[PDB]
Ligand binder design. Structure first.
Ligand SMILES: CCN(CC)C(C)=N
Length: 330
């Protein structure tokens, strides 16, 4: 089997991407944030504290003939940005782009933190990291991908995120029309439960390539590109007036600037992030100070190849017995 679903930016800045997902019988369609940095599929629901729902579409398990309470199971998750959610668990039929999994754990939120409430466009998350990170207790549950894998034509999914435009998540096949050149594959460590790999270096604009190992994670659920302070300083040094602002919480730059590109290495291959991808707009409405799309990972403990990096590539998440990651230009 295969599946193919369009993913759409939630706003004009590509702050996140939502993908429609069918849950239950008859189908209830929710728009979920596909997140290769976590491993829980959770949704706003009829059980979510009413004051914490503001415009989201909810899953109502009592209206699904295939929903079954997973007795005794609870979940609780907190993300790198300080947000969180928790609740109980149902199993139900879940379909993405024509690919159907029966008996999928659907984690129903009883509580969500303010940033989720405040984002009316995201009805929940669909985790695509390794199932070892799944938070369901006392019996850990599998991701949608892990459940689907044996049925797929090939045990892979691909992320093709758009810049200020829709893109595609495919399951079970590689669309050879969706990228240019060849796909370069690179080794993955699953030791931390992430799609963790090592970039071979970077360049800033038309500058020379610096060969240096940068261990990090491919994370569709993170907006920006978080890299070591040395690398980030070298980038912003090429932008007149750019500075790190503790009050704003990162590097900012004059909105009048033209940003240089940023290149990252994948083996001997190179992925080029155009300068415009690194512009996240005024820090507040009407400001002439703009927020940078490349930021320091120094306070995080891990480097993160988030959407800013991934949207510059066609990315293969290869879930074979020994997983690997593939990157192609597009
Ligand atoms: C987990 C990231 N997130 C969704 C974009 C929020 C609202 N905190």
């Amino acid at each position: 089997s295969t599946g193919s679903a369009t993913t759409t930016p939630i706003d004009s800045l590509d702050d996140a991407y939502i993908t429609p997902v069918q849950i239950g019988t008859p189908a209830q369609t929710l728009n979920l944030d596909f997140d290769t940095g976590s491993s829980d599929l959770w949704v706003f629901s009829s059980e979510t504290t009413a004051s914490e729902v503001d415009g989201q579409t909810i899953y109502t398990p009592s209206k699904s003939t295939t929903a079954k309470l997973l007795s005794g199971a609870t979940w609780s998750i907190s993300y790198g940005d300080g947000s969180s959610s928790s609740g109980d668990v149902y199993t139900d039929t879940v379909s993405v782009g024509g690919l159907t999994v029966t008996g999928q754990a659907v984690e129903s939120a009883k509580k969500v933190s303010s940033s989720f409430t405040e984002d009316s466009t995201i009805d929940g998350l669909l985790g695509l990291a390794f199932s070892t990170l799944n938070t369901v207790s006392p019996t850990q549950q599998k991701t949608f991908f892990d459940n689907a894998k044996a049925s797929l034509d090939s045990p892979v999914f691909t992320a093709d995120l758009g810049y200020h435009a829709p893109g595609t998540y495919n399951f079970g096949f590689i669309d050879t029309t969706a990228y240019t050149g060849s796909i370069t594959y690179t080794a993955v460590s699953t030791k931390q439960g992430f799609w963790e790999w090592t970039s071979t270096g970077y360049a800033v604009g038309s500058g020379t390539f610096k060969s240096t190992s940068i261990d990090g994670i491919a994370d569709t659920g993170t907006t920006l590109l978080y890299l070591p302070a040395t690398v980030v300083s070298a980038y912003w040094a090429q932008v007149s007036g750019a500075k790190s602002s503790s009050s704003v919480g990162g590097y900012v730059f004059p909105c009048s600037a033209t940003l240089p590109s940023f290149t990252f290495g994948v083996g001997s291959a190179r992925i080029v992030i155009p300068g415009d991808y690194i512009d996240f707009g005024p820090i507040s409405t009407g400001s002439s100070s703009c927020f940078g799309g490349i930021q320091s990972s120094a306070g995080i403990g891990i480097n993160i190849f988030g959407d800013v990096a991934l949207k510059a590539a066609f990315v293969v998440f290869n879930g074979a017995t020994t997983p690997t990651l593939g990157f192609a230009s597009k």
